[PDB]
Design a protein around this nucleic acid. Sequence first.
DNA 1: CATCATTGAGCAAATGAGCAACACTATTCGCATAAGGTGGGAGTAGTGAGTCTTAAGTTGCAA
Length: 126
Amino acid sequence: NLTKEQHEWLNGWLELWGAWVYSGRLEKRMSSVIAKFMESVDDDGMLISQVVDSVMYIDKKAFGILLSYYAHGSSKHAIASYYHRVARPRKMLCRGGGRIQKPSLATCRREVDEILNASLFMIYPV
DNA sequence: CATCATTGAGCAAATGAGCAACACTATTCGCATAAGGTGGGAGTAGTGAGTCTTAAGTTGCAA
């Protein structure tokens, strides 16, 4: 797990990073997913963009979520809201049981939280 | 003599439903408008039979 100084440090880096990118100052060549986000609208931001694209290159879903939170500046609650909207029925050993249904909102909140913590966790040493 | 099935027993992991607390915005509510404007209007018209109640008119009748 990361610490909280690392949280605030790299948090501020992703704040100026997403504020830098979202103005449109980044090129297509960094990612086609970064290009995808730029279809939906300095060396610091390009260095970090190589970092974040390098680590979060492989998932692209939480990478897009990461752009939604930092580049766009969206609240966590709306992200888990739409994410609960796009939910499919899954197998979970629930408080209810191992039946197969669409999960609750608070579960989706937990998932945005843990994909946040794991995302930041995988970014930080890079 | 050993062992295991077999009956209790409780737990972590996970999750679904909240909670309070702040913070922000949509909606709603309440007040103002300076030349002058000083008695409504539709109201049905072809029911009849009865019954109770006043209201008034008349009329013995007694001091």
